[PDB]
């Protein structure tokens, strides 16, 4: 038989929800103290980018941010390597138990 | 691992002295080989765990 | 291993700003702290302890522009 | 511009339990009497699979602990109202949270 | 497991085993706002340690 784990998967859903919302609203803990796009500007600043253009191209940066997130979302189509790595786990377990 | 020296493994006794003092020598090897196979299987399982 | 850690024991609710847009289209942001308002003066506090202090150039990082949601401070050319 | 890409990391596996004597000698008492001289062979199988399932539980509690160390939340939050900051969309990342 | 003690001496038919929810971790909560109030955010700053 296969026993269920000790925590639900909805509990780990709640834990990733808390760790995602910890970096969006006060007191901005997973954003490390400061607000979110403030922290993004300081991160791009530390690579060699002037704070002038980060203050000047802010909505373009946030649009590209949304676009990257959406293309991540719309890409689980039959050749995603992450889905292959998830399906390998299930196929390996099923083959070992049937054998 | 020490408790495997008192299993019979299909033989008539787990003591080697009782097998070597109650059977003919061609009739004893068949019972000794079962003890040998069981003890070696136990040692291989232990070594894998380590 | 023995691990020693910082640990608060009392809190206070304050209102903070994360940055100021200064006269001449400049900007300042705090370092490891927040811009607060004490007695109608812009001050700086550290983020692990409440202690307001003068806004020097050791508590800020300067920018020759400013972000669109900074707080307005024309009276601040201070130390 | 800003490029996005995801990775996957696996942190657990299914927890398989085996009843040893029902696999070997399912219902027949002649087989159970014959298996009772192999002794502690089914007990070692049970103890190894039990210790594996214990390790799986310990890693699951560690992952759940790391996501929750030092996160303080507003008790007035509501994900149906607050799923957006600085025009960056977080609707697809949040589950349910708040008080209703 | 919590038996009915001598002060909490029960007079009915119930079991001393209780089937509950296992919830090992939390978040600490603050009573503040999520949007800026007059340009300024609320925050909780330690004043002793
Ligand atoms: C600036 O603040 C205003 C009011 O809080 C808000 O509507 C706007 O989205 C903010 N913009 C940025 C870029 O932070
Ligand atoms: C939250 O969980 C923690 C875990 O240590 C526990 O100590 C605390 O009592 C819980 N608080 C509430 C409100 O459930
Ligand atoms: C604290 O929370 C209570 C209810 O939980 C609410 O009535 C009160 O207004 C809150 N205080 C502040 C300062 O927001
Ligand atoms: C912090 O708390 C301790 C004990 O409660 C007290 O003796 C000490 O004076 C406090 N610190 C300040 C700065 O009030």
UniProtKB/Swiss-Prot annotation, chain D:
Primary role: Mediates fusion of the virion and cellular membranes by acting as a class I viral fusion protein. Under the current model, the protein has at least three conformational states: pre-fusion native state, pre-hairpin intermediate state, and post-fusion hairpin state. During viral and target cell membrane fusion, the coiled coil regions (heptad repeats) assume a trimer-of-hairpins structure, positioning the fusion peptide in close proximity to the C-terminal region of the ectodomain.
Name of this chain's protein: Spike protein S2
Organism whose genome encodes this protein: Human coronavirus HKU1 (isolate N2)
Taxonomic lineage: Viruses, Riboviria, Orthornavirae, Pisuviricota, Pisoniviricetes
């Amino acid at each position: 038989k296969v026993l269920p784990p000790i925590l639900s998967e909805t509990q780990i859903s709640g834990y990733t929800t808390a760790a995602t919302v910890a970096a969006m609203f006060p007191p901005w803990s997973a954003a490390a103290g400061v607000p979110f796009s403030l922290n993004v500007q300081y991160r791009i600043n530390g690579l060699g980018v002037t704070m002038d253009v980060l203050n000047k191209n802010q909505k373009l940066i946030a649009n590209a941010f949304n676009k990257a997130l959406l293309s991540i979302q719309n890409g689980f189509t039959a050749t995603n390597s992450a889905l292959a790595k998830i399906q390998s786990v299930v196929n390996a377990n099923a083959q070992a138990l049937n054998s | 691992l020490l408790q495997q020296l008192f299993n019979k493994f299909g033989a008539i006794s787990s003591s080697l002295q009782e097998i070597l003092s109650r059977l003919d020598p061609p009739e004893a090897q068949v019972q000794i080989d079962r003890l040998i196979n069981g003890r070696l299987t136990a040692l291989n399982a232990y070594v894998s765990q380590q | 291993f023995i691990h020693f850690s910082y640990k608060p024991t009392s809190f206070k609710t304050v209102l903070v700003s994360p940055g100021l847009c200064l006269s001449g289209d400049r900007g300042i942001a705090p370092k490891q702290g927040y811009f607060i308002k004490q007695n109608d003066s812009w001050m700086f506090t550290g983020s692990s302890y409440y202690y307001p202090e003068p806004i020097s150039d050791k508590n800020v990082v300067f920018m020759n522009s400013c972000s669109v949601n900074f707080t307005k401070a024309p009276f601040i050319y201070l130390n | 511009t800003i490029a996005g890409h995801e990775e996957f990391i696996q942190t657990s596996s299914p927890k398989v339990t085996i009843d040893c004597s029902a696999f070997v000698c399912s219902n027949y008492a002649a087989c159970h009497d014959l298996l009772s001289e192999y002794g502690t062979f089914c007990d070692n199988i049970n103890s190894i699979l039990n210790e594996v399932n214990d390790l799986l539980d310990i890693t699951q509690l560690q992952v759940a602990n790391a996501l929750m160390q030092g996160v303080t939340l507003s008790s007035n939050l509501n994900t149906n109202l607050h799923s957006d900051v600085d025009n960056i969309d977080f609707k697809s990342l949040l589950g349910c949270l708040g008080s209703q | 497991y919590a038996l009915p003690s001598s002060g909490s001496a029960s007079r009915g038919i119930s079991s001393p085993y209780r089937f509950v929810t296992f919830e090992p971790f939390n978040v600490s909560f603050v009573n503040d706002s999520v949007e800026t109030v007059g340009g300024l955010f609320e925050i909780q700053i330690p004043t002793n340690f």
